[PDB]
Amino acid sequence: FNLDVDSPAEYSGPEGSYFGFAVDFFVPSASSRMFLLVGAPKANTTQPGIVEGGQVLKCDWSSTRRCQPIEFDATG
Amino acid sequence: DMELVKRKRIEAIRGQILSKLRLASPPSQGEVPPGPLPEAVLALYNSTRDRVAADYYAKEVTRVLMVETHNEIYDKFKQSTHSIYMFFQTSELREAVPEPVLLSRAELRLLRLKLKVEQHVELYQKYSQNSWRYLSNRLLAPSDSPEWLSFDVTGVVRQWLSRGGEIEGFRLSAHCSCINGFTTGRRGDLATIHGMNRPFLLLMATPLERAQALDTNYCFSSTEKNCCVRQLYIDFRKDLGWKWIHEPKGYHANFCLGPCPYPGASAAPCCVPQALEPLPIVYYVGRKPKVEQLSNMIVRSCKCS
Amino acid sequence: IDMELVKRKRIEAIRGQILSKLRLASPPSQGEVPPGPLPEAVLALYNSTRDRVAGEPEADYYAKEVTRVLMVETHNEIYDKFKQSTHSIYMFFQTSELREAVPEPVLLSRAELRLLRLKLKVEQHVELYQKYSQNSWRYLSNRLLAPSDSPEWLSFDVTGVVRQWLSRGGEIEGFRLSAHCSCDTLQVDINGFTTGRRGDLATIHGMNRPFLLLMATPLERAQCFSSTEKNCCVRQLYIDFRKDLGWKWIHEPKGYHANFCLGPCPYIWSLVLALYNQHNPGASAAPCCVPQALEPLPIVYYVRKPKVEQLSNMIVRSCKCS
Ligand SMILES: *[C@@H]1O[C@H](CO)[C@@H](O[C@@H]2O[C@H](CO)[C@@H](O[C@@H]3O[C@H](CO)[C@@H](O)[C@H](O[C@H]4O[C@H](CO)[C@@H](O)[C@H](O)[C@@H]4O)[C@@H]3O)[C@H](O)[C@H]2NC(C)=O)[C@H](O)[C@H]1NC(C)=O
Ligand SMILES: *[C@@H]1O[C@H](CO)[C@@H](O[C@@H]2O[C@H](CO)[C@@H](O[C@@H]3O[C@H](CO)[C@@H](O)[C@H](O)[C@@H]3O)[C@H](O)[C@H]2NC(C)=O)[C@H](O)[C@H]1NC(C)=O
C-alpha cells in the first residue's frame, strides 16, 4: 500500500528492443551505490555482423537516470 | 562649431521617425495613466530590450503566450523526460497579424533555469500532429544567471497564418547520438512550466495602415539616377599595368555612384556599398607562387547611410 | 557634371588597396619567375575558391594565403577499423602537411572542409562529427539537403577544429559523416572510392576527393588608438525627448544615445600609402564616414489602443569609410 505512485522513476532503453523483458538489482562491493539491471533481448548491438544480439544495461539510480550498456561480449 | 554639427542630425531624425512611423505630426488624445503604465505592455517592452540569445519602416510588436499543461496538452505527450512540448492557438495568431505578408520577424523566446554544465538542443516542428521535422540547432553555455534565448521561426509562423489549422505547436528535444539534454522528470526544472513568463512567441509585423536595396540584377538592366552600382571591369595590364599577377587578368570590381536624398549619422548620406565579394589572386614571390584571396573587392550592392 | 574619371578614381584606389592588403610597397620582381609553367595543382586551388555556390577585425582586412590538402585514401587506414557502411562515412587527413601549409596554429583564419555531392533528389539530412580521444565523436554542424539533379560542391566551416589540430602534435586526424537521428540510416551520395574501380582510369578516380581548404596569414608578414588625431571615430551624443525634441507623446523610453559619425576620409594625399586600413578600405572614389553597424530601438506610444513598435536602424555603433 506504501508504494509511491506519485513520483516513480522512469527508465527507458532503445525502442523496439523489449527493454524490460528481464529486470533485477545490483549491489556490489562494500557500501557503494546501487543500480538497476534491465534486459533488452532484441536490442541491436555493436557486435560485428551480429543483428539484434541483445544486451543488458546498467542504469544508475543515484541521479540523472542514465543507462550504460554492460559489455558482456564484443566479438562476432 | 561642435554644437552646430549636432543640431543638423536631429532634424534628420525628426524627418526619419515620422517617415518610419508614417506620421505627419505627433498625436494628442485622452490620457491614461497618471501613474506607471500598465504592465501588459511593459512586459512586451521588457521582452524587446532583452537581448541575450530594404524595410526601413516600423514594425508593430505583439506577443502571445503558450498553453498550460491543461487544455488537452496531456493526452499526447507529458512523459518524455528528455523533451519539452509547446503548443499555441491559431485563433489568436491570425488576430495579431491578419495577413501573412504583414509578418516580418517572428522569433520564439524561452526561459532557461539550469546554470550548471552545458547541453545540446535540437528544435522540431509539428507535422501531421504526430511527426516532427527538424528545424534549427543551438548549443548552450553554463551561464551563472537565468538566461533568455530566442529561436527565429519566422518562416514557420508565416506558413501557419495561411492555413486554417486552429491547432499547431513546437517540440524541443535533445541531441540524438546515432537520450540526453534533460535529466529531470518534472519537465519544470530546465524550463518554466505552469508559471508566469512562460515561453512566448514574439511577433514583429507591419500594420495594415502602413501596407495599404537591389543589386546588379536591377542596377545593370536599368538606368538609375540615384545610388546605383555601376559596372567597372578592371584590367591589370590595361588599367594598372601589372603583369606580375597571373590570375586573374581582369575582374568586375564595380563601384557605387549616385545621390541619396531624403538618413542620419553622417552629415551627408553617401552611396556606399552594402555587399562586397572577395577575389582570389595568384602571384609569385621570387620563385614561390602564392595563391591568396583578398577580402571585399567586388562591389555587389549599394546602400545609403 | 561628375564625369567618367570616377572610374579612374576607383582604379587608382584599387591600386593602392591591393598593395596594402599584401603589405607590399611595390610589385615584386618577375625576372626571378619562370614564364610559361603553370601547375594544374594551383589551378585546382583557384577553381575551388570560386566554386562555392553552396555552403554556409584588424587582421581580417589583409590578404590570406589559400592552400588546400587532400585526404587520406581508404587504402591504408580507413579500412582497418570500420570501413564504409550505410550508417556513416569516414574521411581522414594527416598533420605533417597540415602543419606544413600552416606552420603556426595562430596563422589559421578560415578552414572549410569541402566535398562533392551527387544527385540526391528529394530530401536528406546530414550531421557532422569530430574525432575526440581517437575513439569518441563530438557533434559539429547540421545541414538540410536540396534536390540537386547535378553534382554539387559544399563546404563546412571547421576552423575551430583545425586550429585545435595544429596545436597538438597529433599525427593522425579525420572526420565522420553520419545522418540525422530522429529519436524520442544515411542515403547521401558523396564522391567516394567505390572500392572496386580498377584499370588505367582508377588512378584519377581518387581525384575530387574531400579536401580541407585552408586560408592563413603568411609567416613573412607576422607582427582612435591607431590615430593621435580625432579620426572618423564615433562621437558621444545623448538625446533626450523632453529636452531636445519637446515630445511628451512618447512614454517609453525617455532617452537614448543616438551617436553620429564625424571625420574626413581622403586618399592619395602627398607624402607612403601605409595607413590604408582606416582611411579607405573600400577603395571607393569618395570615401565617406558612414555607420557600419546599427541597432534597432523599441518604442511605446499611445493612440485607445497602446501599440508597441520597434524602429529599424537608429543607434549608430561604429563608423567606416566606404
Ligand atoms: C520592466 O523593466 C523595468 C526596468 O527596465 C522595471 O523598472 C523597475 O521599476 C522599479 C520600480 O518598482 C525600480 O525600482 C526603483 O528604482 C529607483 C531607482 O531607479 C528607486 O529610486 C526606487 O526607490 C523605491 O524605494 C524607495 C525607498 O526609499 C521608495 O521611497 C520609492 O518610492 C521607490 O519605491 C525603486 O528602488 C527599478 O529600479 C526599475 N528597474 C530598473 C532596472 O531600473 C519594471 O518594473 C519592469 N516591469 C515588468 C512588468 O517587468
Ligand atoms: C536492428 O537492426 C536491423 C538491421 O540491422 C533492423 O532490421 C531492419 O528492419 C527494417 C524494418 O524494421 C527493415 O526495413 C524494411 O524494408 C522493407 C523493404 O523490404 C520496407 O518496406 C519496410 O518499410 C522496412 O523499411 C530492414 O530491411 C531490416 N534490416 C535488415 C538488415 O534486415 C531492426 O529493425 C533493428 N531493430 C532494432 C530494435 O533496432
Curated annotation (Swiss-Prot), chain A:
Segments annotated as FG-GAP repeats: 2-68
Disulfide bonds: C59-C67
Superkingdom in the source lineage: Eukaryota
Subunit structure: Heterodimer of an alpha and a beta subunit. The alpha subunit is composed of a heavy and a light chain linked by a disulfide bond. Alpha-V (ITGAV) associates with either beta-1 (ITGB1), beta-3 (ITGB3), beta-5 (ITGB5), beta-6 (ITGB6) or beta-8 (ITGB8). Interacts with CIB1. Interacts with RAB25. Integrins ITGAV:ITGB3 and ITGAV:ITGB5 interact with FBLN5 (via N-terminus). ITGAV:ITGB3 and ITGAV:ITGB5 interact with CCN3. ITGAV:ITGB3 interacts with ADGRA2. ITGAV:ITGB3 interacts with FGF2; it is likely that FGF2 can simultaneously bind ITGAV:ITGB3 and FGF receptors. ITGAV:ITGB3 interacts with IL1B. (Microbial infection) Integrin ITGAV:ITGB3 interacts with herpes virus 8/HHV-8 envelope glycoprotein B.
Function: The alpha-V (ITGAV) integrins are receptors for vitronectin, cytotactin, fibronectin, fibrinogen, laminin, matrix metalloproteinase-2, osteopontin, osteomodulin, prothrombin, thrombospondin and vWF. They recognize the sequence R-G-D in a wide array of ligands. ITGAV:ITGB3 binds to fractalkine (CX3CL1) and may act as its coreceptor in CX3CR1-dependent fractalkine signaling. ITGAV:ITGB3 binds to NRG1 (via EGF domain) and this binding is essential for NRG1-ERBB signaling. ITGAV:ITGB3 binds to FGF1 and this binding is essential for FGF1 signaling.
Name under which the protein is recorded: Integrin alpha-V
Protein encoded by which gene: ITGAV
Glycosylated sites: N44
UniProtKB/Swiss-Prot annotation, chain C:
GO cellular component assignments: axon; blood microparticle; cell surface; collagen-containing extracellular matrix; cytoplasm; extracellular matrix; extracellular region; extracellular space
Intrachain disulfide bonds: C224-C233, C232-C289, C261-C319, C265-C321
Tissue expression summary: Highly expressed in bone. Abundantly expressed in articular cartilage and chondrocytes and is increased in osteoarthritis (OA). Colocalizes with ASPN in chondrocytes within OA lesions of articular cartilage.
Mutagenesis / variant outcome for changing R10C: In IBDIMDE; decreased TGFB1-mediated activation of SMAD signaling; reduced levels of secreted TGFB1
Stretches for region Bowtie tail: 184-206
Quaternary structure and interacting proteins, as annotated: Homodimer; disulfide-linked. Interacts with the serine proteases, HTRA1 and HTRA3: the interaction with either inhibits TGFB1-mediated signaling and the HTRA protease activity is required for this inhibition. May interact with THSD4; this interaction may lead to sequestration by FBN1 microfibril assembly and attenuation of TGFB signaling. Interacts with CD109, DPT and ASPN. Interacts with EFEMP2. Interacts with TSKU; the interaction contributes to regulation of the hair cycle.
Annotated disease: Camurati-Engelmann disease: An autosomal dominant disorder characterized by hyperostosis and sclerosis of the diaphyses of long bones. The disease typically presents in early childhood with pain, muscular weakness and waddling gait, and in some cases other features such as exophthalmos, facial paralysis, hearing difficulties and loss of vision.
Other information: TGF-beta-1 is inactivated by fresolimumab (also named GC1008), a monoclonal-neutralizing antibody.
Task of the protein: Transforming growth factor beta-1 proprotein: Precursor of the Latency-associated peptide (LAP) and Transforming growth factor beta-1 (TGF-beta-1) chains, which constitute the regulatory and active subunit of TGF-beta-1, respectively.
Protein name (record): Transforming growth factor beta-1 proprotein
